[PDB]
Amino acid sequence: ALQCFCHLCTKDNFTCVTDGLCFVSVTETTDKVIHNSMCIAEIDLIPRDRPFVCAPSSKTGSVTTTYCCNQDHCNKI
Amino acid sequence: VKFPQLCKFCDVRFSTCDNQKSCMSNCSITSICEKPQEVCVAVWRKNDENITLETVCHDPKLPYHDFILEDAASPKCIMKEKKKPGETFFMCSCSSDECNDNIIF
Amino acid sequence: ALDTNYCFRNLEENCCVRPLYIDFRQDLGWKWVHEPKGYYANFCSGPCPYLRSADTTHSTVLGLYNTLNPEASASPCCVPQDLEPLTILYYVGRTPKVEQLSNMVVKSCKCS
Amino acid sequence: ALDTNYCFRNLEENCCVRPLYIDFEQDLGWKWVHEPKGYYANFCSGPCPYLRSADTTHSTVLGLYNTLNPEASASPCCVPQDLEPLTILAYVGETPKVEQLSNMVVKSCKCS
Amino acid sequence: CELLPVGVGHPVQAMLKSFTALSGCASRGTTSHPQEVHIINLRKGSAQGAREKTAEVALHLRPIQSLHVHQKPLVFILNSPQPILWKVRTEKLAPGVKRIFHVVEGSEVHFEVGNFSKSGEVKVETLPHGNEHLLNWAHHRYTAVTSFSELRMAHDIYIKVGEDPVFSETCKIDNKFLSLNYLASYIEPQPSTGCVLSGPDHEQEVHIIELQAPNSSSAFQVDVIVDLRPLDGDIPLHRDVVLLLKGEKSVNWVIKAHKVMGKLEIMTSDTVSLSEDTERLMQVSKTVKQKLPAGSQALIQWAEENGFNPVTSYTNTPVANHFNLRLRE
C-alpha cells in the first residue's frame, strides 16, 4: 500500500504503510510546534467522499494545518 | 488532496426574497459536491409575481443553462445582473463552505 | 458493570457514564450531516477505587498499589468498554446516502 | 506507536508507557510470589490531545468535542493497549510453581 | 456432535508448557574464583521412542536481571547419559568469553553463533552419574560452583548466567530449590474432546476450542497460546478462519499463526494479544468481548445464528496453556 511517515514509529524507522491517506498535521503553539504524521486507514475514512478527519480543521485560536496527501512519503510539509 | 465543497442542493424551489440587500436561501440540505472541481452557484429568477430559487454545485469550466461564471473563485455569492428576454435572471458564484446559502444582492 | 441503566439511575462518585449531548453543528462544527442532527455520545468519568469491575491484571495490581500508596497517581482511569454504532444520513449531490458510523454509542465503562 | 522506545527517550506528557517497578511483598502485601521480589510493571499516564492514537471513532469524537468544548471535562483517558506476560515463581504448599502471568507489563498506551 | 477423545486427525492439538528443574543449587561465592561453573545433569526421558537418533538439545543464555552483559568465563559441565548435539544460542554476551563444554564421550559442541567457537571447546571426560559425585568433581578442578542444576529429557534449556546476591555463599543440593535464573522449559500432550462436523473448506473454516483450566494455581490472569500452521510442508496457505475460543476462567489468549495468509476472525470471551508475526501475514479482525453461551450445542447454534456456518469442528480441552491448530490443504 502507500508509504507514509509515522513520526512516532521507531521500529520501522518512521515508515507506516497505509491503504488510505498520509496524514500530516502541524500545530502552532505559543512556545512549541508539534507535527503529528500518521497513517489513516480506509475504514477510518468516514464518509469516504469527504472524511471529516481529513476534511479541513482550521479553528480559531490555534494555527493548525490539517493536511492529507496521497503520494508516498509526502506527509512532511 | 483537495476535497469537494459544501454547497446546497435544492433544485427548483419557491422563495419570497426580493428587493433586499441580502437574504438567505432557506434551503434545508447542505451537500458535498460529487466532484472536487464543482463550485457553489445560485440562480434567482423573478417571473411576474413568482420568484424561484435554485442552488447547486456547478462545474466552472462548463456552461449551465448556457452561461459562464466570471468570478467562480469568489468566496461569497454575489448576484450579478444577468440578462434574459423578459426574465429577471440572476446568478452568483462563490467558492467557500455553504456560501450559496447566504445570498447578497 | 457501569452500564447505562446503572450509571444513569443511581448516582455514583466512581467511574461511570456521565450524561452528554453532542450536536453535530453547534459544538463539533460538522456542517454536512442531514439526519439525525444530534446524539448522546456519553463518556466515562469518575475515579477508580480498588476492586471496582477490574479490567486486567495490571489494573488490579495498580489499584492495590494505590490502595497501599495512593500518592503515586499510578491508578486505573475511567475508560469506556462497550461501544455501539450510529446511523446518519448525508446528501451526496441530489442522491442522499445513509451510512452507519460504528463504535459511537458507549453502553458501559471499565476501570483502566 | 506509543511504547517504551519513544516514551522513555522523550519527555512526553501525553498518553504513553511510564516506568513502574513494584516490590511484591513490600508494596502489594504479596507473600505468595517468592521470586521475583519485584518487577517493572509500567503504567499509562498523561492527557490525550486531539488525534493521538485514538482507537475508535468515539474516541476521536470525544477528543474533538473536548477540543471545541474546553470545559466539558470529557476527554479520552490514557489506557494500555497491548501487555506482555510476567513469569512468576509461586509457592504452593511445598512445591514451587513457575507460572506465566499475563497482562502484567504494559507496552502500549492509547487514548481510549 | 458426538463427544469423543481427540486423536491425531483432529484439527486442534492442545499442549501444556511449563518450566521445571529436578534439583540444583546456587552460590555467589564464585566472585573470588576466576571462572563460573554451571552443571546440567541431564536424565533419560520417560519416552521410549528414542532408540537410534541422537537428540539435539539447545541452550539459551541471558545476563541476569541485574546484569546487562555477562563476560565472566562460563564453564558448562554437560553430563549426558547418551550422545547429544548441543546448540548455543547466546544473547547479550560479550565475545571472547571462554565457554568450555566438558561433555561425555560421543557428545560435542555446536554453535548457532560460531564466533565463540574459536574460544569454545569440546572436552571428552568421564563424569559420575550421581549429582553429589558430579558436584564433587567440579570443586576438585574449579574449587567452587557458581550454579548447579539437574534437568530431565527436553529440547531447550534457559540459563540466565549471573551470581544473584540473594543466593547463598555456598551451594547445597535441594530438590525444592528453584529460581528464575535457571529453568528448563518442557511441553507435554494434552488430550481433548470434541467433534468434527465439516471437512476442510478452501474458503472459510470454523473450529471450536474450549478451555477450562489454564493450569494456574493462582487467582489472576494467565496466557494461553494459540498456534496455527499448515498441516504439512512450509507452503503458505490462503484461507479464512473463524475460531470460537471459550475460557471458563480469566485467561489472556495469545495468537501465533505461522505460515498462514488471508483473513482470520477470533470470537472469544477473554482478552487476546496477537503475536507480531501473525498480525502481518493475516488480516485478523479485532475480537469483540461477548459473553458466549454455555455448552457445545449452544455455541454451535449461537455461531450458526451469526452466519458463521458450517462449523468445521468442535474441541474441548480441560487443562492447557498452549493450543495448536493445523490447517489441511
Numbering used by the authors:
A (entry chain C): 31 to 107
B (entry chain D): 45 to 149
C (entry chain A), D (entry chain B): 301 to 412
E (entry chain E): 31 to 359
Paper text:
Betaglycan (BG) is a transmembrane co-receptor of the transforming growth factor-β (TGF-β) family of signaling ligands. It functions by enabling binding of the three TGF-β isoforms to their signaling receptors and is additionally required for inhibin A (InhA) activity. BG is nonetheless essential in vivo, where it binds and potentiates the activity of the three TGF-β isoforms (TGF-β1, -β2 and -β3) by presenting them to their signaling receptors, TGF-β receptor type I (TGFBR1) and TGF-β receptor type II (TGFBR2)4. BG, and a homologous co-receptor of the TGF-β family known as endoglin (ENG) which potentiates the function of BMP9 and BMP10, are transmembrane proteins with a large (approximately 760 amino acids) extracellular region comprised of two domains: the membrane-distal orphan domain and the juxtamembrane zona pellucida (ZP) domain19,20.
Additionally, in a separate approach we wanted to obtain the structure of the TGF-β:BGO complex bound to both of the signaling receptors, TGFBR1 and TGFBR2. As the TGF-β1:(TGFBR2):(TGFBR1)2 heterotetrameric assembly cannot recruit BGO, we aimed to construct a variant with the signaling receptors bound to only one monomer of TGF-β. We therefore switched to the TGF-β3 heterodimer, TGF-β3WD, a mutated form that indeed can bind only one pair of TGFBR2:TGFBR1. We successfully assembled the TGFβ3WD:zfBGO:TGFBR2:TGFBR1 complex and in this case we used the more flexible TGF-β3, expecting that the bound TGFBR1, which spans the TGF-β dimer interface, would lock TGF-β3 in the closed conformation. Cryo-EM analysis of both complexes yielded density that closely accommodated the component structures and enabled domain placement without ambiguity. Despite this, it was difficult to build molecular models due to strong preferential alignment of the particles.
